[PDB]
Each structure stands twice: as structure tokens, then as C-alpha cells.
Symmetry: none
Subunit: 63 residues, 6 copies
């Protein structure tokens, strides 16, 4: 009847510092899935599924 | 009856500093899926699914 | 009747510093799934499943 | 006779990421010296003195 | 006669990530010297003195 | 006659990650010297003195 939320924080990222130094970065992909380099990501889902870094090679459900 | 939200934060990213120094970056993809380099991403979904960095190679559901 | 949440924090990442120095980084993928390099990720899900770094090679459910 | 310098680096700063989150920052100074917040500074001096963050309160050398 | 320097690095800072979270930061100075918060600083001096974070209160050398 | 330096590193800082979380930070200085918070600092001096974090209260050399 008096639901009060003052400083609610849900699904939050703050205060991040990153450095990446690479000479060579190489990805070779043949018929699959690759997910690389995911940084500072925030998500909130209500009445649903939540996925952030998902990879699936392949699906074969013929006939 | 008196729902009060003052400073609600849901699905938020703030205060991010990133540096990337690379000499060579190479992606080769043959019939698949690649997702690279996702940074400072925020999402909120209501009554639905939420995905951020998703990759699927291939699907074969013939006939 | 008087639900009060003042500084609720759920699914939060804050205050992160990372350095990555690599000379060579190589990923070779043939018909599978690879997920690498996931950093500073926050998620909150309500009435749903939550996944963050998931990989599935392949699925064969023919006929 | 054949002085060769290929990739000489002297007095160099590179690849820096910083985040500063402050609610209140206050400096009160009465007759002195204050130096605050010096970041990512590079200097090279040849045949001379080099100073970067220096503070001197006061000097009294009367008569 | 054949001085060769290929990848000489002198006075160098690289690959630094810093986060600072403060609610209140206060400096009060009366007739002195204060130096605070010096980060990622590089210096090279040739035939001279080198100082980076120096503070001197006061000097009295009257008459 | 054939001085060769290939990957000489002198006075170098690299690969540093720092986090500082403080609620209250206070400095009060009356007629002296304070040096606080010095991070990731590199210096090389040739034919000279080298100082990095130095503090001197006061000097009285009258007459």
C-alpha cells in the first residue's frame, strides 16, 4: 500500500576501467559460434529469460 | 496505492573507461557466427526475453 | 503494507580495474562454440532463467 | 658515427584508463600551495631540471 | 661507432587501470604545501635533477 | 664500438591495476608538507639526482 523504493539498483555496472594491449588477435570460425570480448554489460528482465554471452555451434533437427 | 520510486536504477551502466591497443585484429568466418567487442551495453525488458551477445552457427531443419 | 527498500543492490558490479597484456591470442573453432573474455557483467532476472556465459557445441535431434 | 635509434621511447605514458567518482571534493587554501589530481603526464628535459608536481608554501627572505 | 638502440624504453609507464570511489575528499591547508593524487607520470631528465611529487612547507631565510 | 641495446627497459612501470574505495579522506596541514596518493610513476635521471615523493616541513636559516 506504501511500497517505497529509494535508491534501488538492480542489474547495474558502474566504475570500471579496463586496458587491453594485444599485438595479434585472430579468430577463425568454420560452421560454429564464437563470442569474445564482452565488457561492462547490464541487463534486467521481468517475466522473461535473460542471457548475455551465449554461443551455440549448430542444430540439426531434420524432417 | 502509493508506489513511490525515487532513484530506481535498473539495467544501467555508468562510469566506464576503456582503452584497446591492437596491432592486428583479424576475423575469418565461414558459415558460422561471430560476435566480438561489445562494451557498455544496458538493456531492460518487460514481459519478454532479453539477450545481448548471442551467436548461433547454423540451423538445418529441412522438410 | 509498508515495504521500504532504501539502498537495495541486487545483481551489481562496481569498482573494477583490469589490465590484459597479450602478445598473441588465437581462437580456432570448427563446428562448436567458444565464449572467451567476459568481464564486469551484471544481470537480474525476475520469473525467468538467467544465464551469462554459456556455450553448447551442437545438437542433433533428427526426425 | 652510425648512431641508430629505431623505436626509442623516453618519457612516455600510454594505455591508461581511469575513473573517478566523488560526491564532494573540497580544497581550502590560506597562504600555501596545493596541487591535486595530476594524471597521464610525460616530460623529457635535456640539460635542465625537470619537475612535475611541486608545491611550496611560502618564502620569506626579507632585506 | 655503431651505437644501436632498437627498443629502448626509459622513463615509461604503460598499461594502467585505476578506479577511485570516494564520498568526501577534503584538503585544508594553512601556510604549507600539499600534493595529492599523482597517477601515471613518466619523466626522463638528462644532465639535470628530476623531481616528481615534492612538497615544501615554508622557508624563512630573512636578512 | 658496437654497443647494442635491443629491449633495454630502465625506469619503467607497466601492467598495474588499482582500486581505491574510501568514504571519507581528510588532510589538515598547518605549516608543514603532505604528499599522499602517488601511483604508477616512473623516472630515469642521467647525471642528476632523482626524487619522487619527498616532503620537507620547513626550513629556518635566518641571517
Amino acid at each position: 500500500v506504501l511500497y517505497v523504493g529509494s535508491k534501488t539498483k538492480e542489474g547495474v555496472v558502474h566504475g570500471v576501467a579496463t586496458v587491453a594491449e594485444k599485438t595479434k588477435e585472430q579468430v577463425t570460425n568454420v560452421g560454429g559460434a564464437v563470442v569474445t570480448g564482452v565488457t561492462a554489460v547490464a541487463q534486467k528482465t521481468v517475466e522473461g529469460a535473460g542471457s548475455i554471452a551465449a554461443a551455440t555451434g549448430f542444430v540439426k533437427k531434420d524432417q
